[PDB]
Design a protein around this ligand. Structure first.
Ligand SMILES: *[C@@H]1O[C@H](CO)[C@@H](O[C@@H]2O[C@H](CO[C@H]3O[C@H](CO)[C@@H](O)[C@H](O)[C@@H]3O)[C@@H](O[C@H]3O[C@H](CO)[C@@H](O)[C@H](O)[C@@H]3O)[C@H](O[C@@H]3O[C@H](CS(=O)(=O)O)[C@@H](O[C@@H]4O[C@H](CO)[C@@H](O)[C@H](O)[C@H]4O)[C@H](O)[C@H]3O)[C@H]2NC(C)=O)[C@H](O)[C@H]1NC(C)=O
Ligand SMILES: *[C@@H]1O[C@H](CO)[C@@H](O[C@@H]2O[C@H](CO[C@H]3O[C@H](CO)[C@@H](O)[C@H](O)[C@@H]3O)[C@@H](O[C@H]3O[C@H](CO)[C@@H](O)[C@H](O)[C@@H]3O)[C@H](O[C@@H]3O[C@H](CS(=O)(=O)O)[C@@H](O[C@@H]4O[C@H](CO)[C@@H](O)[C@H](O)[C@H]4O)[C@H](O)[C@H]3O)[C@H]2NC(C)=O)[C@H](O)[C@H]1NC(C)=O
Ligand SMILES: *[C@@H]1O[C@H](CO)[C@@H](O[C@@H]2O[C@H](CO[C@H]3O[C@H](CO)[C@@H](O)[C@H](O)[C@@H]3O)[C@@H](O[C@H]3O[C@H](CO)[C@@H](O)[C@H](O)[C@@H]3O)[C@H](O[C@@H]3O[C@H](CS(=O)(=O)O)[C@@H](O)[C@H](O)[C@H]3O)[C@H]2NC(C)=O)[C@H](O)[C@H]1NC(C)=O
Ligand SMILES: *[C@@H]1O[C@H](CO)[C@@H](O[C@@H]2O[C@H](CO[C@H]3O[C@H](CO)[C@@H](O)[C@H](O)[C@@H]3O)[C@@H](O)[C@H](O[C@@H]3O[C@H](CS(=O)(=O)O)[C@@H](O)[C@H](O)[C@H]3O)[C@H]2NC(C)=O)[C@H](O)[C@H]1NC(C)=O
Ligand SMILES: *[C@@H]1O[C@H](CO)[C@@H](O[C@@H]2O[C@H](CO[C@H]3O[C@H](CO)[C@@H](O)[C@H](O)[C@@H]3O)[C@@H](O)[C@H](O[C@@H]3O[C@H](CS(=O)(=O)O)[C@@H](O)[C@H](O)[C@H]3O)[C@H]2NC(C)=O)[C@H](O)[C@H]1NC(C)=O
Ligand SMILES: *[C@@H]1O[C@H](CO)[C@@H](O[C@@H]2O[C@H](CO[C@H]3O[C@H](CO)[C@@H](O)[C@H](O)[C@@H]3O)[C@@H](O)[C@H](O[C@@H]3O[C@H](CS(=O)(=O)O)[C@@H](O)[C@H](O)[C@H]3O)[C@H]2NC(C)=O)[C@H](O)[C@H]1NC(C)=O
Ligand SMILES: *[C@@H]1O[C@H](CO)[C@@H](O[C@@H]2O[C@H](CO)[C@@H](O)[C@H](O[C@@H]3O[C@H](CS(=O)(=O)O)[C@@H](O)[C@H](O)[C@H]3O)[C@H]2NC(C)=O)[C@H](O)[C@H]1NC(C)=O
Ligand SMILES: *[C@@H]1O[C@H](CO)[C@@H](O[C@@H]2O[C@H](CO)[C@@H](O)[C@H](O[C@@H]3O[C@H](CS(=O)(=O)O)[C@@H](O)[C@H](O)[C@H]3O)[C@H]2NC(C)=O)[C@H](O)[C@H]1NC(C)=O
Ligand SMILES: *[C@@H]1O[C@H](CO)[C@@H](O[C@@H]2O[C@H](CO[C@H]3O[C@H](CO)[C@@H](O)[C@H](O)[C@@H]3O)[C@@H](O)[C@H](O)[C@H]2NC(C)=O)[C@H](O)[C@H]1NC(C)=O
Ligand SMILES: *[C@@H]1O[C@H](CO)[C@@H](O[C@@H]2O[C@H](CO[C@H]3O[C@H](CO)[C@@H](O)[C@H](O)[C@@H]3O)[C@@H](O)[C@H](O)[C@H]2NC(C)=O)[C@H](O)[C@H]1NC(C)=O
Ligand SMILES: *[C@@H]1O[C@H](CO)[C@@H](O[C@@H]2O[C@H](CO)[C@@H](O)[C@H](O)[C@H]2NC(C)=O)[C@H](O)[C@H]1NC(C)=O
Ligand SMILES: *[C@@H]1O[C@H](CO)[C@@H](O[C@@H]2O[C@H](CO)[C@@H](O)[C@H](O)[C@H]2NC(C)=O)[C@H](O)[C@H]1NC(C)=O
Ligand SMILES: *[C@@H]1O[C@H](CO)[C@@H](O[C@@H]2O[C@H](CO)[C@@H](O)[C@H](O)[C@H]2NC(C)=O)[C@H](O)[C@H]1NC(C)=O
Ligand SMILES: *[C@@H]1O[C@H](CO)[C@@H](O)[C@H](O)[C@H]1NC(C)=O
Length: 1040
């Protein structure tokens, strides 16, 4: 039982799952373990308990939560069914609320109920009236008493009517049924009873939940206050970036356990877009080609080459010594035509260059001028047609001879020196639709919570409408015409004789960067001029989307034909006409994000609607969820730092990168993978994305939703793992071929996700580091993706949704010198390294510390940011941290020092020498300074003896003005400094103390004890770190 039921309390539970008798059954229970009961008085205890139960029944509007009717009821004094179980020590009763068992009783096998009341397999329950029985019967709802009235519930009452009619009620009226209960407090047997149940839901339609988030979706990052202006509206205007997951909750009362859900997303942009389109192929009748022209075949991103298509009556095309055999044939009303496909290029070749798999030509039917079509086939009726190559050195000219109907024609191609690219540019009202699926489980039915992708890696269909227009002159014997389409594509017709056809047409592909050559649409338009009662010039046209894969250009589907007609009763005349036209492109999977950015469908204006389908039960959502798209530029920042940030081991510099577009999964450390399959939706099977949580990539089979579906072994599993070397890097491990199928939150690898084409990533985003003057960089040319485990910070407890991500990534930088030249096994510690999750360490020599610098360049991870902010440069952000110069000092405590005292301290001070205690500087030779710091550690490496400076001179100027310079020798030092070592005085305050000794100085000079020695002492030290030369002086004093 979940939840458990307290001493002397009441609770209610819904009967569900496999083998459940019927819908709308609830079991009420009261805990009676607190007292003793016997066969003598069991009927008294059940009587006492069941007398005190009160039940409330409501109806509500499923979206708003508004109550629409309420009744409150009580068990009768006789004729009800209620039981006692000796084993579990509980009294229990079952009520049936919904159709058909509203007025009649239903029987519940005791095998089933044992899920909730396990005692029932051990002993049969006590009945009312003290008997024992093998089977349980419901008390029906329509038998209970209205507390308002003192009578049995009215058959006419609206709540009872509703519950009895729930089937049509829920769907049509968005009505939802809810029940709760309470036990009116009483004392029995020296114990007391009190409680109120949680409420329970009998039925509800399948909807997006609309409380409190009115839009049905939400983005945790916006609800917590982290998105600025956009946090004012998180309850009714959700936004998300390109490739990320947005959260959602569905209410589902039909489901049991886990359910696969399928989703459909429709995107729209206000107002039309201007589209740029490149000519893949050009097909004409031999009569329509111009006399002489220059041509050279273009080569597209996917390797395919443009081709030139001649249609002719002649069984070969002839060109002197060379003859061309036709790629295919077709027939119209017994007349037979041949189709020749050529690539103009390098050298005459006898084998196919590439292929085209189906191709539809449309023509006006002779009878009715309605459109009809045929697919061109090979001479053995196979569909795939081959393309051949002709050509030679530039400026070579080739004459091709053919026939159109009765008449011979000759055409003269010049082989160009540079590829012919024709661009057409038009305005079109674009829209796109996409599909996706996920497997979802719950612990709080009927609420199912999940998240869906913003843009999926499926096929996506881009679609939109446009206009074609025709202009023309008709005469007694022949007709002339031109057409415009796609704004500035132009086709022309040489004068068409009566009863003759003529063809022209073009194939385009999208003329953007990488998606070129991957997909297409083809239009071919046939014309016919004939005499009826009237002179009629008619056009008919095909419309087919096409895709290229493995060098076959193939038809995906055919949409409907279109036609236009120009009519003249007069013999000479001039005319015009128009028709709508349609356009459709199917993206190939890997290209699908790129498409949406380039055509302009994703951007700050885009708006998206979502519907959802239950794969177990065959139901669709009766309401829709909504969200809006956004693109946001990155930012870099630092908290203000002084020199203090670089002294002792626990001091570092923090940089914050703000980049929300890098956060693909709302939960930090969350991970998912993705593949493409057929998905069940509606009553159809459609190519779509399946999202799988975790870190393993699958190549599945069958259809998602049905029983065929099987994900095999993990092809690869990606993991961050520790590695050897100093510190210990954590870096990504796994087969790099599959990175375009894995998502994380780490910007050092998120750039691959849906942004890899032909096996190279489009945008070399992420974080890049250069360092100076010790030259190093990450990533180096050899370095893997995912060179460090950088992850975003979590929202804390005062926020509405804790534990969720935030757009801040916090990155720690250490620069240090004290562990330079340390060794860790085979490793020598010098340069730039990664440590832990979010840390970099740079170790530089003593002479290079001040002025060292690190420059961080962060480049956006998302292709939308690169596209919208290319010109302004707001796609990269830079920052530098660098070590500032600082003033050291050397000083005797006082200007005058007495000769009476044996030792007079000389203190040195320099911030960057400081460390944890103990630390000491030793002196030797010609005054060379050695620094030691045994307790110093940084991520496991410990400090080495450093050589940091020297005492430069010591001199005394005497009372007669003579100046003596004391020579620094290993023997002289030991007298002047009885301890050759100076200690640090306090932690991280670099201030060292030395004991220059007057008792030594006298003997070292051989000068008369005091009588001569009214003198000025002078001392000097040079440090390598800054480069400064410090000096200190004192007047030696006695009675003079
Ligand atoms: C593919 O195969 C094609 C079909 O056979 C070849 O086409 C033929 O190309 C000839 C040029 O090719 C030669 O030169 C290039 C260097 O530029 C080499 O790479 C080639 O290997 C080859 O040696 C072309 O000849 C014309 O250009 C020549 C320049 O070298 C020159 O002889 C003339 O200027 C030619 O006009 C062919 O075009 C036809 O040529 C004949 C003459 S012939 O066949 O060359 O002997 C002409 O007939 C003449 O017309 C004139 C009118 O002024 C009369 O005075 C004369 O009595 C009569 O002979 C035709 O007018 C002319 O069209 C051309 N053949 C055709 C018809 O297509 C092609 O080279 C191969 N391509 C490669 C390199 O892969
Ligand atoms: C928005 O909707 C998101 C859906 O993507 C929710 O993300 C899911 O978050 C889970 C943690 O969230 C919990 O805690 C937060 C507070 O921080 C609450 O707001 C939430 O209500 C919730 O209580 C996370 O579950 C995992 O972490 C849990 C520890 O908190 C742990 O109990 C679980 O056992 C999970 O490991 C989901 O993260 C992923 O979970 C899947 C498993 S499952 O999806 O939970 O079933 C893991 O995949 C597995 O990986 C192993 C590798 O060892 C494989 O062997 C196995 O094949 C594979 O199943 C992932 O490793 C793990 O990252 C997380 N879902 C995803 C896909 O990221 C988010 O919470 C929702 N927001 C709100 C506010 O509710
Ligand atoms: C349909 O209308 C379109 C109007 O946008 C035309 O597209 C634009 O065409 C410009 C002219 O070049 C065209 O003529 C070629 C030679 O016959 C032919 O191969 C193509 O049809 C080709 O598009 C084109 O200019 C380019 O070429 C010029 C000539 O070499 C050169 O001077 C330019 O620098 C440029 O490379 C347009 O591209 C844009 O041109 C701008 C200057 S201007 O030439 O338009 O005055 C330039 O500032 C800009 O950077 C550049 O993008 C091209 N426009 C676009 C966006 O595609 C199209 O040709 C018309 N279709 C037909 C029937 O040909
Ligand atoms: C009626 O009342 C008593 C008091 O409320 C209560 O017993 C307490 O609950 C369970 C036993 O019953 C539950 O668990 C079993 C499965 O183990 C199921 O079959 C039952 O249907 C119940 O769900 C014991 O766990 C309690 O002992 C204590 O439990 C604490 C957690 S709790 O959430 O379960 O209460 C632990 O922290 C303690 O360490 C542990 O001692 C027991 N409480 C006591 C001390 O009496 C029953 O739930 C109710 N009666 C029955 C039999 O259902
Ligand atoms: C279909 O695909 C090919 C291959 O990707 C593409 O060629 C690449 O075009 C870019 C620029 O694209 C724009 O200009 C051309 C005209 O030059 C237009 O046709 C396009 O519509 C675009 O407006 C060329 O610059 C590429 O050359 C490369 O430039 C790179 C820098 S970039 O930022 O400019 O891209 C360098 O890093 C490369 O070293 C250099 O090769 C060119 N790429 C290649 C590999 O040749 C076609 O233009 C596309 N054509 C169609 C039908 O649009
Ligand atoms: C910090 O960096 C300084 C400045 O670059 C460097 O000083 C250089 O000292 C070396 C000798 O140091 C070696 O011995 C001591 C033992 O006392 C060790 O602690 C060190 O680890 C070294 O093994 C001197 O050779 C340099 O003096 C000059 O060298 C020039 C050539 S160079 O290529 O060596 O620089 C000559 O042309 C000059 O005539 C000579 O004066 C000295 N470098 C300079 C330019 O002053 C320290 O060793 C580094 N200190 C530590 C320990 O990190
Ligand atoms: C799509 O719309 C976004 C929302 O306006 C644009 O994002 C804004 O980008 C600009 C810089 O170009 C910047 O002003 C915003 O940064 C925030 O500014 C806020 C001030 S206010 O605008 O709310 O008054 C600050 O409160 C906040 O700390 C800054 O982070 C930025 N807005 C957001 C959401 O961060 C985006 O530029 C635009 N994209 C396109 C296609 O141009
Ligand atoms: C372009 O020409 C193709 C042949 O050059 C045509 O292919 C023929 O199509 C017919 C009808 O679809 C098909 O039955 C032929 O297959 C042959 O059938 C022969 C008997 S009969 O049909 O001639 O009576 C048999 O000998 C044998 O089964 C097949 O060889 C097929 N002909 C060949 C030679 O393959 C094609 O229809 C035409 N394309 C269009 C669209 O006009
Ligand atoms: C587009 O043309 C392709 C020719 O390369 C062809 O793809 C190959 O198909 C084979 C098996 O198909 C046989 O039949 C075709 C007839 O077009 C032959 O050309 C081919 O050699 C085979 O005998 C298969 O091994 C593989 O998918 C492709 N071969 C290669 C080079 O790997 C396609 O059949 C055709 N259209 C489509 C996609 O149906
Ligand atoms: C940190 O500031 C110091 C104090 O101003 C400064 O040392 C003093 O200035 C000069 C040194 O200038 C020479 O040295 C530099 C660095 O090698 C060279 O660019 C060039 O040869 C300069 O002429 C020195 O003579 C003077 O004694 C120093 N003053 C004191 C107080 O003793 C440092 O130069 C400075 N460090 C850096 C790298 O910025
Ligand atoms: C019903 O009868 C049983 C006895 O058969 C009761 O148990 C006794 O209760 C008294 C006080 O209530 C206790 O002092 C005894 O220890 C119990 N005797 C036995 C035989 O166990 C039980 O409590 C009775 N229930 C009610 C509600 O009266
Ligand atoms: C989302 O786009 C889909 C296009 O796939 C649309 O659903 C189609 O609805 C039309 C009638 O409007 C029917 O001809 C088709 O049966 C539907 N298509 C499919 C494949 O099921 C619809 O226009 C858009 N739906 C929304 C949410 O507005
Ligand atoms: C196109 O030219 C071809 C040349 O092959 C002509 O084909 C003729 O076809 C008819 C059958 O209708 C036969 O009687 C002749 O034997 C063929 N003539 C020749 C010379 O081969 C045909 O005349 C022309 N087609 C059109 C549409 O005018
Ligand atoms: C100190 O200077 C003397 C004299 O120039 C020289 O002999 C000696 O090698 C120097 N010692 C060191 C190690 O600094």
């Amino acid at each position: 039982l979940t939840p458990p039921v307290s001493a002397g309390g009441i609770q209610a539970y819904l009967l569900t799952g496999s083998g459940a008798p019927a819908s709308g059954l609830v079991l009420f229970v009261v805990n009676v373990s607190n007292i003793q009961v016997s066969s003598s008085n069991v009927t008294n205890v059940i009587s006492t308990v069941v007398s005190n139960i009160q039940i409330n029944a409501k109806t509500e509007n499923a979206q708003t939560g508004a109550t629409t009717g309420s009744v409150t009821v009580r068990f009768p004094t006789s004729g009800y069914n209620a039981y006692y179980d000796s084993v579990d020590k509980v009294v229990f009763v079952v009520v049936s609320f919904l159709y058909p068992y509203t007025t009649t009783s239903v029987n519940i096998p005791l095998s089933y109920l044992s899920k909730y009341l396990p005692g029932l397999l051990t002993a049969q329950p006590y009945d009312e009236t003290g008997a024992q029985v093998t089977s349980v019967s419901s008390t029906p709802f329509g038998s209970l008493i209205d507390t308002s009235t003192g009578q049995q519930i009215l058959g006419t009452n609206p709540v009872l009517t509703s519950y009895n009619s729930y089937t049509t009620q829920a769907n049509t009226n968005m009505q939802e049924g809810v029940v709760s209960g309470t036990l009116t407090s009483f004392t029995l047997g020296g114990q007391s009873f009190s409680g109120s149940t949680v409420p329970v839901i009998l039925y509800a339609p399948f909807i997006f939940s609309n409380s409190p988030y009115q839009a049905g979706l939400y983005n945790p990052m916006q609800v917590n206050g982290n998105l600025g202006s956009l946090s004012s509206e998180a309850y009714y205007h959700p936004v998300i970036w390109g490739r990320a997951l947005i959260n959602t909750t569905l209410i589902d009362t039909y489901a049991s356990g886990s359910v696969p859900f399928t989703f459909q997303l429709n995107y729209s942009v206000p107002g039309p877009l201007t589209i740029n389109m490149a000519q893949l192929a050009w097909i004409a009748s031999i009569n329509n080609l111009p006399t002489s022209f220059t041509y050279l075949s273009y080569k597209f991103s996917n390797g395919y080459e443009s081709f030139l298509g001649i249609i002719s009556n002649s069984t070969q095309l002839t060109a002197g010594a060379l003859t061309i055999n036709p790629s295919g044939n077709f027939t119209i009303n017994g007349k037979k035509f041949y189709v020749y496909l050529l690539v103009v290029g390098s050298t005459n070749s006898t084998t196919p260059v590439e292929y085209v798999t189906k191709l539809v030509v449309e023509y006006p039917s002779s009878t009715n001028f309605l459109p009809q079509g045929v697919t061109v086939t090979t001479s053995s009726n196979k569909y795939t047609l081959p393309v051949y190559e002709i050509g030679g050195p530039a400026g070579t000219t080739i004459t091709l001879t053919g026939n159109w109907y009765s008449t011979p024609y000759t055409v003269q191609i010049t082989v160009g020196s540079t590829p012919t690219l024709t661009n057409y540019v038009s305005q079109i009202l674009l829209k796109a639709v996409a599909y996706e699926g996920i497997n979802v489980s719950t612990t709080q039915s009927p609420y199912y919570s999940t998240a869906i992708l913003s843009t999926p890696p499926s096929e996506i269909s881009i679609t939109g409408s446009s206009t074609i227009t025709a202009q023309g002159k008709l005469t007694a014997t022949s007709a002339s015409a031109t057409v415009n389409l796609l704004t500035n594509a132009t086709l022309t017709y040489e004068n068409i004789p009566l009863t003759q056809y003529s063809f022209n047409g073009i194939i385009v592909t999208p003329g953007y960067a990488a998606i070129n050559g991957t997909t297409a649409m083809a239009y071919v338009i046939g014309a016919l001029y004939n005499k009826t009662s009237d002179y009629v010039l008619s056009f008919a046209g095909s419309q087919e989307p096409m895709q290229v894969m493995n060098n076959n250009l193939t038809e995906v589907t055919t949409l409907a034909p279109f036609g236009l007609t120009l009519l003249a009763p007069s013999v000479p005349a001039t005319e015009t006409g128009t028709s709508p036209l349609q356009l459709e492109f199917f993206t190939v999977p890997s290209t699908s994000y790129i498409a949406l950015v380039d055509f302009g469908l994703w951007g700050n204006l885009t708006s998206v609607t979502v519907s959802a389908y239950d794969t177990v039960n065959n139901k669709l959502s009766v309401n829709l969820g909504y969200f809006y798209g956004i693109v946001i530029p990155p930012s870099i920042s630092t908290a203000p730092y002084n020199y203090q940030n670089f002294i002792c081991p626990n001091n570092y510099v923090t940089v914050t990168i703000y980049d929300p577009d890098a956060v693909l999964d709302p939960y930090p450390s969350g991970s998912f993978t993705t593949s493409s399959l057929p998905l069940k939706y509606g009553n159809m099977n459609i190519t779509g994305a399946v999202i799988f949580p975790g870190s393993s990539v699958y190549n599945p089979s069958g259809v998602f939703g049905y029983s065929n579906f099987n994900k095999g072994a993990a092809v690869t599993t990606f993991t961050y793992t520790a590695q050897s070397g100093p510190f210990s890097p954590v870096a990504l491990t796994g087969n790099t071929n599959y990175l375009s199928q894995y998502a994380d939150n780490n910007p050092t690898d998120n750039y691959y996700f849906i942004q890899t084409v032909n096996g190279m990533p489009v945008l070399m985003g992420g974080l890049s580091i250069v360092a100076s003057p010790v030259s190093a960089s990450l990533p180096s040319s050899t370095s893997s993706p995912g060179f460090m485990y950088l992850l975003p910070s979590a929202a804390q407890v005062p926020s509405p949704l804790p534990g969720m991500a935030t757009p801040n990534y916090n990155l720690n930088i250490y620069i240090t010198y004290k562990i330079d030249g340390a060794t860790v096994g085979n490793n020598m510690i010098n340069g730039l390294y990664v440590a832990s999750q979010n840390t970099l360490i740079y170790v530089v020599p003593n002479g290079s510390f001040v002025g060292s610098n690190i420059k961080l360049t962060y480049t956006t991870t998302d292709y939308a940011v690169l596209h919208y902010f290319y010109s302004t440069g707001q796609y990269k952000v830079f920052k530098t941290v660098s070590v500032p110069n600082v003033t050291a000092n050397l000083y005797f405590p006082s200007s005058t020092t007495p000769l009476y005292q044996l030792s007079v301290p000389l203190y040195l001070s320099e911030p960057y020498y400081g460390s944890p205690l103990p630390t000491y500087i030793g002196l030797g030779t010609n005054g060379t300074s050695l620094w030691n710091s045994p307790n110093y550690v940084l991520f496991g490496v410990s400090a080495v003896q450093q050589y940091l400076g020297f005492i430069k001179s010591i001199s005394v100027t005497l009372s007669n003005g003579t100046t003596v310079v004391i020579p620094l020798t290993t023997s002289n030092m030991q007298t002047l400094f009885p301890q050759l070592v100076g200690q640090e005085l306090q932690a991280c305050n670099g201030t060292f103390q030395f004991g220059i000794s007057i008792t030594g100085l006298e003997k070292l000079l051989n000068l008369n004890v005091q009588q001569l020695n009214n003198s000025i002492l002078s001392v000097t030290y040079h440090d390598y770190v800054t480069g400064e030369t410090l000096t200190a002086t004192t007047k030696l004093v006695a009675l003079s």
